[PDB]
Design a protein around this ligand. Structure first.
Ligand SMILES: *[C@@H]1O[C@H](CO)[C@@H](O[C@@H]2O[C@H](CO)[C@@H](O[C@@H]3O[C@H](CO[C@H]4O[C@H](CO)[C@@H](O)[C@H](O[C@H]5O[C@H](CO)[C@@H](O)[C@H](O)[C@@H]5O[C@H]5O[C@H](CO)[C@@H](O)[C@H](O)[C@@H]5O)[C@@H]4O)[C@@H](O)[C@H](O[C@H]4O[C@H](CO)[C@@H](O)[C@H](O)[C@@H]4O[C@H]4O[C@H](CO)[C@@H](O)[C@H](O)[C@@H]4O)[C@@H]3O)[C@H](O)[C@H]2NC(C)=O)[C@H](O)[C@H]1NC(C)=O
Ligand SMILES: O=C(CCc1c[nH]c(=O)o1)N1C[C@H]2CCN(C(=O)c3cc(OCC4CCOCC4)nc(C4CC4)c3)CC[C@H]2C1
Ligand SMILES: [Ca+2]
Ligand SMILES: [Cl-]
Ligand SMILES: [K+]
Ligand code: NA
Ligand code: NA
Ligand SMILES: [Zn+2]
Length: 800
């Protein structure tokens, strides 16, 4: 702190102790030079010019200047030209399409300014629009989504760092605002020094991606005591540096409206002022850009990290009300819960019994416990040693705490966030404005994991490997689009014919089964004659090395795995007209050998008989067969999959009731169903040596999940099989569980709980692609980028 900040204010390259720092983060480290405050955080005379301040003689003690040299120097007050040159405020100008970057000579690319606002709930765009005129102009003149989905948990650090890396928290490492890493034996907290250590922070964030590729970055982080006006002026000043020193990417962060929303609730009357203040800050940025003639050159992103919900202390569930042993557990509390043993020397500690004591115990229980691998796959919240094996998903509006003492010894607060990222109130904002963004364009909602890629595109950078689907946000952009090619199929299928006699099959299976017109008929169905009906978008590509067969049938086509002894995928189309029939009595326990598939690559009924826990189901539902004759195909051993009796309740209702219901509402649907194996809960397809469970005494592996992809025409006046334009999709990844403990109402009728469980396990097609190594929608007439957008769509089942 002995050295000086003279001419070093907000140095871009930080310096090494014990030499004092003048970087915008030095306050946060107590390493600022003695004179930092006087030299770098000047405030003299305020933030604005007045009439009398114009053409003044430069006074270095001022906050910002109104002299005439200031423009070259880059440090005029942001309203200088308005008060001293008759100019108008950016907000008061009509918008004009920005067809090309209109940049000063010397700029090699449009700079990018990322303006992030903590806790900026998506509905503030509509509800606060009267008091945010600069933000409303960006929104209605630029590209905007009605909202942007955060990642889970909907906390500040996990979301800011996803924005920076394009990674799910489980991959980047910042899986909460608070963490314990058992390998380091260290804790990460909001307050304190451990969070600065580099070993917490995985992946490659944008500022490191920029630097490694020759693009210079302004520093993204700001000490909370540097006032917002000083942050804006600093960025404007950096933008005035000579070509060889001037950064190309900048970030401003605002602590508002999050700070106030915690105290007052998302819509407390006190919330108007922070919203005005954010707007005025945007105003200043745009005014300042306009003076430097940079307001049609720079791309501006206005983005939130998460929204904000109404939460008060009277809405707290206490674990002490459920557990006798509360003192043998550590709880990461609040809008999510993570539980571990207080002491790893405690050999009596048992997650199963803790879960059981936490499961459906009160009529209106406001949290639900999970082993982390049983959490909905759409949250991608398991594959990190910093995520405790026991997780509590907390109802929106609620807290979970260990004991009452914690709450009144640590009603103050009215707002909080952290809940499931599908929750409406957690949704945040996205606006893009600039030469590279589209003009007056609304785009559909998307996930924040997608932005890193887009920010790399806006700067001409190659993104590090990440969880975005690169190309899925091309429709936000006027140019710099990224044009990916479909992945190459790695394995080609066999097309087996009839090669085996009934009597070669010793499977312990039985079935009650027993004309030249109709015989040529049947053979063609087996040759793939109706495949254009049931495979509407082409067969999926297998993206890994395996042996598999395509099997055709009247009512469905499948890609049958010789390794896993079941289909990887089964595909079928159900028209609006289609009729549900029931399984005939003579066929209730019917399983038939498939004369195209070797007994050695087939399942067997004995294994299921022997396995007291495991039963079986069918991927193509016998209920939906087009004729009594076609129904025999649905009972083929190659259409069969292992299912727990508890899960059969779910599956049967989906197949007997819901598929037809969706076909009614959507004017026909195409369905692709199959098994998922994710025993190590990494969100990726298991190889065969990773499978932890098999049907008793056989090589039949047991899936962890079952998926379905349900596709139809976006224009529902066209039938699914005759669709001329964009598609509509919803999908699910259902956990394959031996009980229905997840659904508190499961002893009632399937119609009261099944559809709710499915909504909870809604999925993107892209989630199913990672989990299966398949690539879907290979043959459509749609552009590939549009297909990528479709694959990343998540049907949320939240109201308007
Ligand atoms: C979302 O996108 C991300 C980014 O693409 C995807 O994550 C990738 O998944 C890959 C496949 O699982 C994974 O590949 C592995 O790389 C290993 C090398 O890892 C280091 O180097 C990379 C590159 O710089 C670095 O990114 C890694 O950083 C991780 O770990 C550090 C330090 O621990 C953390 O700071 C950081 O946050 C990150 O942690 C995350 O990833 C790891 C897995 O790497 C998780 O376990 C953590 O929980 C956390 O999520 C690393 O520093 C390499 O060792 C692996 O190779 C093994 O398997 C292959 C098979 O090809 C084999 O050839 C090798 O020999 C090796 O096997 C040997 O080791 C095995 C394990 O020790 C052992 O069992 C065997 O017996 C063998 O001896 C593997 O290729 C890649 O690292 C991550 N990247 C990131 C950033 O997470 C992610 O999958 C996407 N998610 C979805 C759902 O799509
Ligand atoms: O005070 C708080 C949070 C308190 C709080 C309330 N609710 C909650 O969850 O946390 N903080 C005090 C600190 C305030 C200053 N911060 C940063 O400079 C910053 C910005 C930032 O941008 C990343 C860009 C990436 C590109 O796209 C736009 C965002 N990435 C970080 C971390 C992740 C590297 C920190 C905010 C975080 C701190 C957190
Ligand atoms: Ca896996
Ligand atoms: Cl947390
Ligand atoms: K059985
Ligand atoms: Na480039
Ligand atoms: Na139940
Ligand atoms: Zn907050």
């Amino acid at each position: 702190t002995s050295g000086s900040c003279k001419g070093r204010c907000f140095e871009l390259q930080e310096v090494g102790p014990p030499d004092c720092r003048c970087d915008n983060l030095c306050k946060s480290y107590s390493s600022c030079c003695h004179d930092f405050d006087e030299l770098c955080l000047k405030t003299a005379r305020g933030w604005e010019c007045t009439k009398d301040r114009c053409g003044e003689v430069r006074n270095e003690e001022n906050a910002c200047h109104c002299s005439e040299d200031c423009l070259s120097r880059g440090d005029c007050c942001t309203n200088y030209q308005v008060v001293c040159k008759g100019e108008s405020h950016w907000v008061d100008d009509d918008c004009e399409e920005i067809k090309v970057p209109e940049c000063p000579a010397g700029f090699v690319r449009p700079p990018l300014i990322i303006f992030s606002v903590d806790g900026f709930r998506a509905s503030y765009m509509k509800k606060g629009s009267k008091v945010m005129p600069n933000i409303e102009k960006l929104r209605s003149c630029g590209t905007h989504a009605p909202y942007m989905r955060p990642v889970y948990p909907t906390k500040t650090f996990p979301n800011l760092y996803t924005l920076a890396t394009g990674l799910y928290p489980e991959s980047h490492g910042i899986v909460g605002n608070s963490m314990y890493d058992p390998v380091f034996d260290a804790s990460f907290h909001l307050r304190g020094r451990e969070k600065f250590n580099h070993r917490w922070w995985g992946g490659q964030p944008l500022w490191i991606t920029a630097t490694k590729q020759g693009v210079r970055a302004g520093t993204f982080f700001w000490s909370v005591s540097i006032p917002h006006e000083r942050r804006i002026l600093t960025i404007l000043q950096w933008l005035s540096l000579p070509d060889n020193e001037r950064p190309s990417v900048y970030a401003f962060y605002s602590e508002q409206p999050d700070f106030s929303g915690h105290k007052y609730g998302p819509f407390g009357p006190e919330m108007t002022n922070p919203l005005r203040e954010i707007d005025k800050t945007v105003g200043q940025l745009m005014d300042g850009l306009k003076q430097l003639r940079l307001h049609r050159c720079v791309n501006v992103i206005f983005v939130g990290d998460h929204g904000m919900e109404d939460v008060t202390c009277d809405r707290t569930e206490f674990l002490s009300n459920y557990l006798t042993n509360v003192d043998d557990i550590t709880l990461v509390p609040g809008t999510l819960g993570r539980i571990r043993a207080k002491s790893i020397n405690n050999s009596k500690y048992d997650p199963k019994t803790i879960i059981a004591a936490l499961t459906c115990k009160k009529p209106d229980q406001h949290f639900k416990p999970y082993m982390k691998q049983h959490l909905p796959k759409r949250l991608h919240y398991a594959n990190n040693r910093r995520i405790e094996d026991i997780h509590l998903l907390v109802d929106r509006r609620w807290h979970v705490a260990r004991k009452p003492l914690d709450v009144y010894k640590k009603c103050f607060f009215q707002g909080d966030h952290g809940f499931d990222n599908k929750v409406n109130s957690m949704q945040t904002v996205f606006v893009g404005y600039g030469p590279t963004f589209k003009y007056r364009t609304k785009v559909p909602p998307f996930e924040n994991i997608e932005l890193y890629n887009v920010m790399c595109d806006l700067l001409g950078l190659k993104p590090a490997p990440n969880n975005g689907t690169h190309g899925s946000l091309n429709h936000l952009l006027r140019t710099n689009t990224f044009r990916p090619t479909m992945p190459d199929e790695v394995s080609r299928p066999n097309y087996p014919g009839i090669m085996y006699l009934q009597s070669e099959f010793d499977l312990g299976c039985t079935c009650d089964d027993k004309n030249k017109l109709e015989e040529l008929n049947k053979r063609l169905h087996t040759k793939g004659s109706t495949k254009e009906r049931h495979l509407l978008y082409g067969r999926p590509a297998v993206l890994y090395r395996t042996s598999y067969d395509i099997l055709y049938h009247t009512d469905f086509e499948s890609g049958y795995s010789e390794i896993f002894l079941m289909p990887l995928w089964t595909s079928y189309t159900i028209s609006k007209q289609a009729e549900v029939s029931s399984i005939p009595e003579h066929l209730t326990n019917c399983v038939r050998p498939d004369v195209r598939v070797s007994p050695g690559f087939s399942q067997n009924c004995l294994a299921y008989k022997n396995d007291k826990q495991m039963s079986y189901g069918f991927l193509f539902p016998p209920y939906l067969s087009s004729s009594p004759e076609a129904k025999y195909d649905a009972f083929l051993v190659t259409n069969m999959v292992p299912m727990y009796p508890a899960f059969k309740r779910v599956w049967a209702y989906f197949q007997r009731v819901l598929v037809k219901k969706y076909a009614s509402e959507r004017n026909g649907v195409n369905v692709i169903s199959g098994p998922i194996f994710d025993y190590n809960y990494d969100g990726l397809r298991d190889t065969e040596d990773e499978i932890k469970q098999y049907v008793e005494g056989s090589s039949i592996p047991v899936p962890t999940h079952y998926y379905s992809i349900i596709t139809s025409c976006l224009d529902f006046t066209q039938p699914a099989d005759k669709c001329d334009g964009p598609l509509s999709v919803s999908s699910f990844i259902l956990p394959h569980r031996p009980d229905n403990d997840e659904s508190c109402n499961s002893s009632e009728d399937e119609s009261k709980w099944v559809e709710e469980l499915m909504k909870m396990h809604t999925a993107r097609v892209r989630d199913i692609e990672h989990l299966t190594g398949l690539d879907f929608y290979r043959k459509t007439s749609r552009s590939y980028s549009e297909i990528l957008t479709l694959k990343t769509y998540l049907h949320t089942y939240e109201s308007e």
